Design an enzyme around this catalytic site. Structure first.
Site, PDB file in Angstrom:
ATOM      1  CD  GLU A 410      22.777 -12.850  -5.049  1.00  0.00           C
ATOM      2  OE1 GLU A 410      21.620 -12.252  -4.386  1.00  0.00           O
ATOM      3  OE2 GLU A 410      23.432 -12.502  -5.930  1.00  0.00           O
ATOM      4  CD  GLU A 495      21.753 -13.717  -9.963  1.00  0.00           C
ATOM      5  OE1 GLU A 495      21.460 -14.584  -8.940  1.00  0.00           O
ATOM      6  OE2 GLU A 495      21.365 -12.824  -9.565  1.00  0.00           O
TER       7      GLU A 495
END
Length: 810
Positions: A410, A495
């Site tokens: 991220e 994820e």
């Protein structure tokens, strides 16, 4: 004075002094002459944060679990024996969170910013050689906020001295590979390549050979291979390379995690002067753009979880049995892979996966140069990233469990040109050390509206082309689409889900809610609470299940962890997570059984919820199960069968699902007290599994169950003791929250207590704990004396109980 019996690595965890700054700066703490005689004495590993009371005003906030960091000092005064004279000695930390400065005898050795890598200082010439005392100091700077999750603070991983001859194998100085094992295995052989790096830290050049011996798991010699002598110039590193073979090799796999062991003998003037061991596995694997993942030629899906590094009531303080337990529980759920989110693994975790059969994806970074929190690693990244990512890879390059290196999670920078540059570097730096494993990244920013195939940002797309395998966070909408648009890509869910759930909590059973808070500070275990950017466990699973090319997924998360109590932001006492399939205490939530039902062959069936309701109230009852059908019986009276249809994927793999899309079975049952039973059957009506849920009486006693009845008397091994509040018939009282007091006697000590309740702000380091949904946990640590441990537990108004665990000199 240090204990040296000739070992190459000496445990250096004992006899430290420690003190946290609570009143501003402690003058002179780094100096040899400072007086620390009234400071606490302790042994490492140690996490200072976990010992503190929860603090609603902590700068860590909810994100870091409302536990303070700050500045901490560790001090060790010690001497070196005669037996070590003229050895090379390095001080080796497996990890320190974070930004530490290490001093020796008043001189700075170094400052190490990153909190999750090992690091090392050579101190051979820096120690006093008269038997005058050396004073080692580590200043730990965990100024907050530095972290989106609970970090812990201090020297939370093991410490060592590495002690060698001036001629030695270098740090991480072996590299064992099996090239073209795909092919070589066809003729029942493994070609083994061995690269050895030898340091000469002596004054004068020397003539050196390397003898390399491979042993199997039993200790039998398999090969021996000795080099020519070679000139090893003073002050340099000198490489050696050897090829050999293993015939009918036993392969490392998930089911059979077999390893061999290489012993490296460094030989100078017919004397073995240094000896180094390298445990390794023989296996090959592939990510294929259309067919997904395989290991040793066997197609399988990656049934993965993400894991943070804390071990619950132990905090960050690593422990071999602690992690091993976590990994076993994940194996029981059907898991075969671990994403170590979002930083390198402890050695103990790697070892657990190597030993038990789990893939590992090891990730370096949660930010690049753009910080997420002001005191995170962003501010150090440009200077340190090359070093830190190489440390990760160099450390782990022989570990058979590890299959992929992740360069980031991220990462903000991925939407600009600087970030593309940075990705190039990172991938290059990895490949300088290891080209046998694919690089990857975890990326969230192509999620878009969660429905359309999001047009990819061009910088992100450059970066997906720079890594070998593309990890998508929460972006199922792109799974097929990006595959069709970029036929060479290999994709997986790095994820997924981020559904939220509390153990034993059964609220709003018929509503599916997003990022929603309740007055009880809990979340529901009907797979019906999840964050707005995520999905139900089921929904995230289906996307993966239905696509062959998707290598698999890694759910957020396997185990709850301290901090990030989403969706309860800024709501002390919510302090720990709801994302886990299993709570911080190792107790499964109902969703653990759902994953079993989807990921394991062994027939099972699991009912929820509990069976303590008001008469006539209609209860949503679910069965998680891999059987064809289930009959539900209340008090001996049938309430009907429900069944799955047999379905198949577009590539012909069978799976079970109802006509209406559900991957579980459901009834609506008016409550009548008693016994509710599920009878799971195959198509032929034959019974293959059972489960029961039973109405509980009045709480009558506490009942202890130890997970292992024998452990090692080594001072670190652990026994995990379940405490259940039960009625007179031994049934767990499903909503019980009684305060339990624990006492340990014999050859062990209480190390912590827990109940997995995310909105509890009870101490972990205490000897009392309320039950939560009928259960609590006590963790006991063995001493160095063999003997026996007894754990006593009591609760006002109920009967006490005891259980015992034997400890044995390893």
């Amino acid at each position: 004075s240090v204990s040296y019996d000739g070992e190459r690595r000496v445990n250096f965890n004992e006899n430290w002094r420690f003190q946290r700054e609570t009143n501003g700066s402690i003058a002179g703490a780094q100096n040899p002459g400072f007086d620390d005689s009234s400071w606490r004495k302790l042994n490492l590993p140690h996490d200072w944060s976990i010992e503190l009371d929860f603090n609603k005003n902590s700068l860590a906030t909810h994100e870091g679990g409302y536990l303070d960091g700050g500045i901490g000092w560790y001090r060790k005064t010690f001497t070196i024996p005669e037996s070590m004279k003229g050895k090379r000695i390095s001080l080796d930390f497996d990890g320190v969170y974070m930004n530490s400065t290490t001093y020796l005898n008043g001189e700075v050795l170094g400052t190490y910013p990153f909190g999750y890598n090992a690091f090392s200082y050579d101190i051979s010439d820096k120690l006093y050689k008269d038997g005058r005392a050396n004073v080692l100091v580590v200043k730990v700077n965990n100024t907050q906020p530095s972290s989106r999750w609970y970090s812990g603070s201090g020297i939370y991983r093991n410490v060592y001295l590495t002690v060698t001859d001036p001629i030695h194998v270098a740090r991480y100085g072996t590299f064992v590979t099996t090239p073209n094992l795909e092919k070589s295995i066809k003729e029942d052989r493994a070609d083994v390549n061995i690269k050895t790096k030898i340091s000469n830290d002596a004054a004068e050049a020397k003539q050196v050979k390397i003898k390399s011996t491979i042993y199997d798991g039993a200790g039998n010699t398999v090969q021996t291979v000795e080099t020519e002598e070679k000139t090893a110039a003073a002050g340099t590193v000198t490489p050696f390379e050897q090829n050999t073979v293993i015939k009918q090799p036993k392969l490392w796999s998930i089911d059979k995690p077999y390893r061999y062991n290489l012993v490296t003998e460094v030989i100078v003037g017919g004397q073995t002067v240094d000896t180094y061991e390298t445990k390794f596995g023989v296996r090959y694997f592939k990510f294929d753009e259309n067919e997904g993942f395989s290991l040793n030629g066997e197609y399988m899906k990656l049934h993965g979880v993400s894991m943070h590094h804390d071990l619950g009531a132990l905090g960050a303080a690593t422990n071999a049995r602690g992690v091993e337990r976590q990994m076993q529980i994940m194996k029981d759920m059907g898991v075969n892979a671990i994403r170590v989110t979002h930083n390198p693994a402890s050695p103990e975790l790697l070892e657990a996966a190597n030993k038990l059969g789990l893939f590992i994806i090891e990730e370096a970074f949660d930010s690049w140069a753009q910080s997420k929190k002001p005191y995170d690693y962003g501010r150090f990244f440009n200077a340190w990233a090359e070093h830190d990512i190489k440390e990760m890879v160099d450390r782990g390059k022989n570990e058979p469990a590890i299959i992929m290196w992740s360069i980031g999670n991220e990462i903000y920078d991925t939407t600009n040109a600087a970030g593309v540059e940075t990705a190039r570097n990172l991938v290059g730096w990895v490949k300088e050390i290891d080209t046998t494993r694919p690089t990857t990244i975890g990326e969230d920013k192509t999620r878009g509206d969660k429905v359309n195939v999001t047009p990819i940002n061009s910088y992100i797309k450059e970066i997906f082309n720079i890594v070998d395998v593309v990890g998508l966070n929460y972006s199922e909408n792109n799974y097929d689409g990006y595959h069709k648009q970029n036929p060479s890509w290999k994709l997986y869910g790095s994820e997924t889900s981020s559904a939220t759930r509390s153990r034993g909590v059964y609220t709003h059973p018929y509503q599916y809610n997003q990022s929603t808070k309740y007055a009880d500070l809990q979340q529901s275990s009907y797979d019906n609470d999840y964050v707005g950017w995520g999905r139900t466990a089921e929904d995230a699973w289906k996307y993966d299940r239905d696509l062959k090319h998707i290598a698999g997924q890694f759910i957020w998360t396997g185990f709850d962890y301290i901090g990030e109590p989403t969706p309860y932001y800024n709501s002390y006492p919510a302090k720990s997570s709801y994302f886990g399939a299993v709570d911080t205490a190792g107790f499964p939530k109902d969703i653990f059984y759902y994953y079993q039902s989807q990921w394991k062959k062994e027939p099972m069936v699991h009912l929820l919820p509990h069976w303590n309701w008001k008469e006539g109230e209609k209860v949503r009852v679910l069965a998680y199960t891999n059987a064809s059908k289930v009959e539900l019986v209340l008090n001996g009276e049938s309430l009907g069968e429900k069944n799955y249809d047999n379905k198949q994927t577009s590539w012909g793999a069978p799976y079970k699902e109802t006509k209406d899309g559900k991957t579980y079975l459901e009834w609506a049952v008016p409550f009548k007290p008693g016994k509710l039973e599920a009878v799971a059957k195959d198509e032929n009506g034959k019974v293959i599994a059972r489960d029961q849920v039973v109405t509980a009486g009045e709480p009558a006693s506490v009942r202890l169950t130890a997970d292992r009845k024998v452990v090692k008397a080594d001072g670190t091994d652990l026994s995990f003791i379940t405490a259940d509040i039960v009625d007179s018939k031994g049934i767990v009282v499903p909503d019980a929250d009684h305060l339990i007091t624990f006492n340990v006697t014999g050859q062990g000590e209480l190390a912590g207590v827990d109940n997995g309740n995310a909105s509890s702000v009870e101490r972990y380091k205490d000897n009392k704990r309320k039950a939560f949904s009928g259960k609590a946990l006590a963790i006991v640590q063995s001493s160095k004396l063999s003997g026996k441990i007894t754990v006593h537990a009591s609760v006002a108004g109920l009967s006490s109980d005891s259980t015992s665990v034997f400890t044995v000199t390893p």
